[PDB]
């Protein structure tokens, strides 16, 4: 029983701390849209009008109440901010809409170790799912005028058939929409408290056009000249999730009860936050995640189909019987078809865009070195031995805070567990 003399692959020590919390620019699994189908009102397309139209699809509003106060914050300024936006909408015709720079607005508009907590893995599982709606390929259909090899467009087009209804795709489209509206407002007003509706559009299970309202953002002042100059903002986001079941996830938020829906109470997650022309541009460019994940899908498919000396694309996507380990359940490791693979590799790329951080950039470069070293131990019956740097020390040092980074560690631990069991 002296394994204790041997150095072999242990898992990574994650940090002790109060449970990690949510920190993305907007809500993910917890989001709630009010929407309109076939929208055709006068001025459709125009955010503020579309928004007013989504707000009128709902009749359950009640008198706002704080229900999970932010504990750094002056909570009643967040009620007054909601109430203010509610008030300022009940009106008569213009395109955009600045808020009375009231007292509670002006206020609202201006390491510690934490441990892993389950909500993040649950968010990840939701991101990989199919939705009833599709989030790309929404226009009238036409030729692919665009010069691209046969097999490469076959792969691209198969992938799209698998990711177009993926929930991670809604998140890309949501970041694109919101960030680009934010850039627009930040540059037109600059001295204005513009009310910025959080929108996406999609097409439904039946094929209808649909426009969605997740909530609203108010911009602070936006005289920005460095790319790094910061726009404060307050985001207010509808949700049906009762923040009291997992109050640790909501530490950054004041949460209000604002209504009932068909029957559950309805919540508004509120928090202040900040961005810059560079972060907004990052959001605006979240379709790169479709690219990134296609390329890894394509090279998985290359590698395999070279072994078998035929193109396997068609057979992988259609028969759905080649599979790949990609998840775990109470029975051990589970394999899925190429379509779950595309959606999951999508979601990983989207999350690590939603949670970009230096801790991620470190963890992911160092852990790759260990990865290759553990696959070499695994794949070679006389593998030899390997020098770690302070590989463990370089990796483990990235594990401070970050919910996303900390799952990735947990996920890597799982792997080590199985790679060598």
């Amino acid at each position: 029983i002296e394994p204790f003399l041997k150095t072999t692959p242990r898992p990574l020590r994650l940090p002790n701390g109060p449970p990690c919390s949510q920190r993305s620019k907007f809500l993910l699994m917890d989001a709630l849209k009010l929407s309109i189908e076939d929208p055709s009102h006068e001025g459709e397309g125009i955010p503020l009008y579309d928004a007013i139209k989504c707000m009128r699809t709902f009749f359950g509003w009640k008198e706002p109440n704080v229900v999970k106060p932010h504990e750094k914050g002056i909570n009643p300024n967040y009620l007054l901010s909601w109430k203010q936006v509610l008030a300022e909408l009940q009106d008569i015709i213009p395109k955009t809409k600045n808020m009375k720079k009231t007292s509670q607005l002006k206020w609202a508009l201006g390491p510690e170790l934490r441990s892993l907590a389950s909500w993040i893995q649950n968010e990840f599982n939701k991101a990989c799912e199919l939705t009833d709606s599709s989030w790309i390929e929404l226009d009238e259909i036409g030729e692919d005028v665009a010069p691209i090899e046969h097999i490469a467009s076959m792969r691209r087009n198969y992938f799209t058939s698998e990711v177009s209804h993926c929930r991670a795709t809604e998140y890309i489209m949501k970041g694109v929409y919101i960030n680009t509206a934010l850039l627009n407002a930040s540059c037109a007003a600059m001295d204005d408290f513009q009310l910025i509706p959080m929108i996406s559009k999609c097409r439904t299970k039946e094929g209808r056009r649909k426009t969605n309202l997740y909530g609203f953002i108010i911009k602070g002042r936006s005289h920005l000249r460095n790319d790094t100059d910061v726009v404060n903002f307050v985001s207010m986001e509808f949700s049906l999730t009762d923040p009291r079941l997992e109050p640790h996830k909501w530490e950054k938020y004041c949460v209000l009860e604002i209504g009932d829906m068909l029957s559950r109470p309805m919540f508004l997650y509120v928090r202040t936050n900040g961005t810059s022309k560079i972060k907004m541009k990052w959001g605006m460019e979240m379709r790169r995640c479709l690219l990134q994940s296609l390329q890894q899908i394509e090279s998985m498919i290359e590698a395999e189909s070279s072994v078998k000396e035929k193109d396997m694309t068609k057979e992988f996507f259609e028969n759905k019987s080649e599979t790949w380990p990609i998840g775990e359940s109470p029975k051990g490791v589970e394999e899925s078809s190429i379509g779950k693979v595309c959606r999951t590799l999508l979601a990983k790329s989207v999350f690590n865009s939603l949670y970009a951080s230096p801790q991620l950039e470190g963890f992911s470069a160092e852990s790759r070195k260990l990865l290759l070293i553990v696959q070499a131990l695994r794949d070679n019956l006389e593998p030899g031995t390997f020098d770690l740097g302070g590989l463990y020390e370089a990796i483990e040092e990235c594990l401070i805070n970050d919910p996303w980074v900390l799952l990735n560690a947990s996920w890597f631990n799982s792997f080590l567990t199985h790679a060598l069991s």
Binding site: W324, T344, K348, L371, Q375, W411, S414, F415, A419
Partner: peptide, 15 residues
């Protein structure tokens, strides 16, 4: 299932 995409590497040689 809990989805864990680093479990791919039980099968896919890190490209």
């Amino acid at each position: 299932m809990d989805v864990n995409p680093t479990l791919l590497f039980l099968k896919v040689p890190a490209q």
